[PDB]
């Protein structure tokens, strides 16, 4: 806290959807103590062995003969660190990995797979510390979530349909900050996915609701978008002090 | 930040500038100097630009488009095709080749835009290099009319013939390593 | 819109991206205040 540098405290862009922008303590700890957003989840950790076995099965020749070769072998498959070889086809590998994430065979919902198309690296991180959030999945310009899923969730009790079934169906997906760097998001389905003057026609995900970017204390603020920003921080601090 | 941009020069203000003044720090964050022009140069923009050029530090790197080192066995050989003409001209009445010539050639090529922006002259640059380094570096300069501004630098003629050194016949820093050291020195320390 | 301009008024209500960018600006102001207090206090003590 003693350090007066105004770099580590500032609200970074990557905090979107995973740490509350409003809720921070004021004083020596401005921006140094943060609070999770409402829908944020933190990875618990997993064994990388099944992912490595799948990669070995697909291709990912390791101990190759200087095959990168100006990255002719598109992408180098990384895991939690540990360059484990490289593949000639990166897009087929990425698509197969996403399908496996849906079927939940080798990839738990938390397993994070990032391909950097330029620089040609795929990172595949499962390291027990990543903070991720649920996002709806957009195929073409259509959300995968449909009336069947919503109707079953609406009957949630005595229908034995829950959020985990929504994840298993492949309708929603957990995305961490590294994957948030490689994903085109839409705030709302109707306003953005639908055909208009085409800003983007390659949306890959959709926000479940924007208001989930706020934390617990900032979520009680009514009409927070009509207040000045420091006032929402003040209300977070003061709502931690209300009597009830 | 939020300082009004009267000019394109940043200035420390506020608490940090008060700290600098109060502490009498030897190194100000933004040391600046306001210069007022005495004569008609103040009124006329071209003379003011002349003063600006005279007051602004310019290294050879700032005006150098690209530098190359070619091993040229003979000056008449002209390994680079382009210099074959002007080298010939300079060797129609060769000067300082009596001792010897360096087998290595530093063919610096200057950007015309930077040269004309700073209003530098090929004779000016050549004089600075040759005089400051001494007779050891011999420089051949192109005409400004030529499309490429080329300066051909060679190591000491007497040092190449080794009659002047006498002592022991042992290469010091070879010649190409010495030429690379010279190139770095010219790039960052010419102060044209 | 991409780089931070907020065209909506407070009465109209900021859109979500504008809301996040506004939070970034407010955070910077708060950090400035908190950092300022200590440096100014040290200067004042030295002068006195």
């Amino acid at each position: 806290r003693d350090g007066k540098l105004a770099k580590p405290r500032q609200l970074h862009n990557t905090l979107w959807g995973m740490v509350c922008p409003a809720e921070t303590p004021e004083g020596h700890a401005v921006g140094l103590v943060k609070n999770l957003a409402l829908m944020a989840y933190i990875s618990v950790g997993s064994q990388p062995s099944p992912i490595l076995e799948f990669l070995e099965e697909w291709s990912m020749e390791n101990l190759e003969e200087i095959s990168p070769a100006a990255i002719a072998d598109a992408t180098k498959i990384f895991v939690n660190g540990c360059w484990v070889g490289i593949h000639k086809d990166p897009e087929q590998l990425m698509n197969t990995l996403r399908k496996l994430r849906r079927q939940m065979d080798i990839i738990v919902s938390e397993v994070s797979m990032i391909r950097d198309i330029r620089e040609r690296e795929i990172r595949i991180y499962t390291d027990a510390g990543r903070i991720c959030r649920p996002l709806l999945i957009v195929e073409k310009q259509k959300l995968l979530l449909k009336k069947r899923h919503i109707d079953q969730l609406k009957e949630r009790e005595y229908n034995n349909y829950s959020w985990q079934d929504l994840v298993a169906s492949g309708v929603v997906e957990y995305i961490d900050t590294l994957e948030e760097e490689t994903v085109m998001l839409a705030m709302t389905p109707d306003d953005l996915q639908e055909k208009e003057v085409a800003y983007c026609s390659t949306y890959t995900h959709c926000e479940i609701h924007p208001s989930m970017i706020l934390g617990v204390c900032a979520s009680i603020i009514p009409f927070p978008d009509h207040n000045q920003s420091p006032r929402n921080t003040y209300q977070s601090a003061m709502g931690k002090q209300a009597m009830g | 930040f939020h300082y009004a941009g009267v000019s394109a020069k940043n200035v420390t203000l506020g608490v940090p500038r008060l700290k600098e003044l109060i502490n009498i720090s030897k190194k100000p964050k933004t040391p600046s100097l306001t210069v007022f022009l005495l004569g008609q140069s103040a009124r006329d923009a071209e003379r003011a630009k002349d003063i600006l050029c005279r007051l602004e530090h310019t290294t050879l790197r700032k005006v150098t488009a690209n530098t190359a080192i070619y091993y040229d066995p003979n000056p008449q050989s002209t390994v680079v095709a382009e210099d074959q003409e002007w080298v010939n001209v300079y060797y129609e009445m060769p000067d300082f080749d009596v001792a010897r010539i360096s087998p290595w050639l530093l063919r610096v090529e200057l950007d015309r835009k930077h040269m004309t922006d700073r209003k530098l002259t090929m004779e000016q640059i050549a004089e600075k290099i040759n005089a400051g380094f001494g007779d050891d570096l011999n420089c051949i300069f192109n005409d400004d009319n030529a499309e490429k501004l080329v300066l051909r630098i060679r190591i000491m003629n007497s040092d190449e013939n080794k009659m002047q050194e006498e002592e022991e016949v042992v290469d010091k820093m070879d010649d190409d390593v010495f030429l690379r050291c010279i190139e770095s020195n010219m790039l960052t320390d010419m102060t044209l | 819109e991409s780089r931070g301009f907020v065209e909506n008024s407070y009465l109209a209500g900021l859109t979500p991206t504008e809301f996040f960018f506004h939070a970034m600006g407010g955070r910077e102001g708060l950090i400035d205040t908190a950092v300022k207090t200590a440096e100014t206090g040290y200067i004042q003590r030295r002068l006195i």
Binding site: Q228, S229 | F1, H2, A4 | H22, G25, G26, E28, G29
Partner: peptide, 8 residues
């Protein structure tokens, strides 16, 4: 939060 010349 206003502009570049104002405040954040």
């Amino acid at each position: 939060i206003w502009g570049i010349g104002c405040n954040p």
